[PDB]
Amino acid sequence: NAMKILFSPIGNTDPWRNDRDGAMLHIVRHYQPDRVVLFFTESIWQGNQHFSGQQAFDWVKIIQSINENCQIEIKCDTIEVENDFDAYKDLFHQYLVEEKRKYPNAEIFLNVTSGTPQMETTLCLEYVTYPDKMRCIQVSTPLTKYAQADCQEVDLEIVNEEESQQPSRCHKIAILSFREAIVRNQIKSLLDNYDYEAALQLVASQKSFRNGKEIRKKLKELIDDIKMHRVFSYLIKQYPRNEKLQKALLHTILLEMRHQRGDIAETLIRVKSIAEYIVEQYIQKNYPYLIIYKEDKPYFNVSYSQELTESYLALMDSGFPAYRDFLQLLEASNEMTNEMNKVNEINNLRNKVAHNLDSLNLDRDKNGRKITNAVTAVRTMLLAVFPEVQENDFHYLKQFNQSIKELL
Amino acid sequence: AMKILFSPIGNTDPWRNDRDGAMLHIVRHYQPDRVVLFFTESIWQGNQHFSGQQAFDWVKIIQSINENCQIEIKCDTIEVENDFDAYKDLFHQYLVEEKRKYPNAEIFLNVTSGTPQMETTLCLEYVTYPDKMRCIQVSTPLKYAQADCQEVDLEIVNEEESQQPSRCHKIAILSFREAIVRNQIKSLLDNYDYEAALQLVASQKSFRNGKEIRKKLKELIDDIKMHRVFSYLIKQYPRNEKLQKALLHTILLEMRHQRGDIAETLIRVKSIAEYIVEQYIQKNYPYLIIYKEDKPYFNVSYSQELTESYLALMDMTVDSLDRILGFPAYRDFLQLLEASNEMTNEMNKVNEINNLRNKVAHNLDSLNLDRDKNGRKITNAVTAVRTMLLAVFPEVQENDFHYLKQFNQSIKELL
Ligand SMILES: Nc1ncnc2c1ncn2[C@@H]1O[C@@H]2COP(=O)(O)O[C@H]3[C@@H](F)[C@H](n4cnc5c(N)ncnc54)O[C@@H]3COP(=O)(O)O[C@H]3[C@@H](F)[C@H](n4cnc5c(N)ncnc54)O[C@@H]3COP(=O)(O)O[C@H]3[C@@H](F)[C@H](n4cnc5c(N)ncnc54)O[C@@H]3COP(=O)(O)O[C@H]3[C@@H](F)[C@H](n4cnc5c(N)ncnc54)O[C@@H]3COP(=O)(O)O[C@H]3[C@@H](F)[C@H](n4cnc5c(N)ncnc54)O[C@@H]3COP(=O)(O)O[C@H]2[C@H]1F
């Protein structure tokens, strides 16, 4: 229930040879197309010493004889060099573009047996390049009688009767595996750069992929995970009882992704908020009721340790900056202190790009290195706050990439 | 550079009608260092109209016109010699092998010899793995070859080809691969996947304008990554560096929002808004804001008529409020200085996503567009930014909001 158009070169074994259909007629016979576009070289239509010339055969009559209500279209071109790819690259491209234009829902069947061998290769290369609603059909030679214009009508019905008890010699060839490889090698490099939307895009387009449904599912889940800051289901299963761990872990993974990919300005802006979330929970865990919230926003309480309250005042007269102040007073030059310093080294640099909208310059005053130390600090802190986190889960993205490649 | 010839064999080989066949002709005019001949077992065995290709001395024939040539003969059993299946994996194995042991060698493929499927397979391979490969065609020059008269037939063939042209042509079919990559790239630009588009353009050396496409794609990539103002904006709006940066971020903001990235959109809209109003308060109420230490602090003496009003707003005196100005303060000052004019409604839309911003930005919560119509408020907060930007900077031209749309069409046209 669709329009079937056949594009068919024409060769010396057409319309038939040895009382057996020629490649063009055999596709017509076994596929019954609604439209047929024939392409004759000027030289094979006129003729040479060894061949009468294809203008002698009534092409519309022969095709409609075995295919009812078949629309036929003859194309004839002058080709100075008939084995030259250049003569067919653009000529065949322009014809098929016209058929696709006129009949967008039609199925296009290409004869890759008729004409010169380079006609086969050009149609096979067009197909590989534009596979949609297109397919290549090959007709095999039967495993000496020549087509005669003078004896057309008799020969046709002889060929009919001999073909009535013979099996089909048409075979839909399988060469889209070549296009698949081009796309496969392209997707591998996209995955390494965390270009998952682009990976999905190339995968979606390639209907050939044997594991397409699984690939598309895993990619979309991850893509939406990234966009809405959703914890990865794997992280949900690994750490089911600690949602606070899950979220700090998702962000540290995404933070390292952005930094690795070159989204450095992006990285710098988000380092602090993740650093704040991990320090916030560090304070709850080891000095619990120091923090008090009435509208879900950290507020410093003095009743936890009144004496310590006054020591902050001593320091002040002389949020992350507050946690950093609190902590150093309770414990100085310890594991946690020297990590939050490195996050504070970019505090004022973060303000420039976050709130003054300025550009980022790694070249100036050792700037990029300052960002790398801050990222490293976030990982080092996360492990101190949540000792249950496994170092091997930091490679979730690299592990996800590899699992996808093996599916490609 | 080492030159490797992978040539199938056909019936016209080694020679026909006193002129070379496809293989020997490429051999003559290219002098490869290594030749790999591929034979179907059927053509090797024969016994149909001839004794088979085994009767010829391929090593002796090929080295007769190529002094230093190491020749590998591969023979395989092919049940159906017109079936792509038997060649597309087989030939792939052979070419992969040659490249592994000879990584810097040029691969010359004979596309003329054998059945058409051998021609088409090798062309499909080259289109797929073009690096260091090329396809050579031998045209017919316009009495078959027997093995009993080898050494005389070779000499005859040699003397007659001495005075004949090259007859070998390097095919140009890499346009097909270029058309595959071209349409891959068009979609990538549509989604703003510039790094992926650069990858795909860089992989395709054939691209006529790849050098221009690459330098333009890297500039934009770096400007987005490092938040560098578009040079076009620098030239189109000089002497207002504040406008330049507010405009860049409004484009990056809208870019993010249009392609998803809704959680990253949510966090940034507030910071770009606070920037726009800050320059709106400077421009309209000079010295209302004082930058006491590289941050917007409030001027308690700018105007005492509404300095009491701000105090009155805070449910005790002015000694306490030396806190850096943020978005709430700006909004507070503007509802006392004006009465719900075009600007306070726009700021309200940004305020409409404030609770959601903290939730996502600072508590690290996930984003849901379906729930509580959060996607609809977010969209309103982005429009508000672009609307404020136009009020604070009337100078800005509306058509510059399509900068990315235009950049993609420029890259597309060059493809
Ligand atoms: N019923 C029936 N019957 C029959 N048949 C049939 C049927 N149905 C179906 N079918 C199918 O179809 C097809 C046929 O074809 P046709 O159509 O006929 O076509 C032809 C023609 F016609 C065309 N043309 C030409 N011209 C023209 C024009 N104008 N227009 C249009 N068209 C045309 O083409 C074709 C061919 O012919 P030729 O002659 O060759 O031609 C050539 C040239 F001449 C041309 N031209 C033109 N013009 C020009 C100019 N100006 N210039 C230049 N040129 C030119 O072109 C062409 C080309 O081609 P190529 O290939 O590329 O080339 C060639 C030549 F030329 C070259 N060279 C160089 N040098 C030289 C010298 N010195 N001398 C000479 N020559 C030369 O080289 C080449 C050659 O080749 P070879 O090597 O020979 O190869 C062959 C053979 F041998 C192979 N084989 C076979 N077997 C084997 C084995 N085992 N192994 C290995 N190998 C082999 O192949 C080939 C072919 O042959 P054949 O016979 O055909 O074969 C077939 C079959 F039989 C097979 N097989 C086997 N087994 C089997 C089985 N089991 N199954 C199945 N099958 C088989 O395979 C094949 C197939 O093929 P196809 O095509 O696809 O198909 C056919 C049939 F079958």
Author numbering:
A (entry chain A): -1 to 141, 148 to 322, 341 to 430
B (entry chain B): 0 to 141, 149 to 321, 331 to 430
What do the study authors state?
Upon activation, the RNase activity of Csm6/Csx1 enzymes, catalyzed by their ‘higher eukaryotes and prokaryotes nucleotide binding’ (HEPN) domains, provides an auxiliary interference mechanism to facilitate invader clearance and may induce dormancy or cell death. The biological activity of Csm6 enzymes is thus controlled by the interplay of the HEPN domain RNase activity and the slow, cis-acting ring nuclease activity of the CARF domain.
The structure reveals that EiCsm6 adopts the canonical homodimeric architecture of Csm6/Csx1 enzymes, with extensive dimerization interfaces between the CARF and HEPN domains. The 2’-fluoro ribose moieties adopt the C2’-endo conformation in all positions, while the adenine bases adopt the syn conformation in nucleotides A1/A4 and A2/A5, and anti in A3/A6. As a consequence of the C2’-endo ribose pucker in A6/A3 and the positioning of A1/A4 in its binding pocket, the A6–A1 (and A3–A4) dinucleotide is forced into a conformation favoring an in-line nucleophilic attack of the A6/A3 2’-hydroxyl group onto the downstream scissile phosphodiester group to form a 2’,3’-cyclic phosphate trinucleotide product.
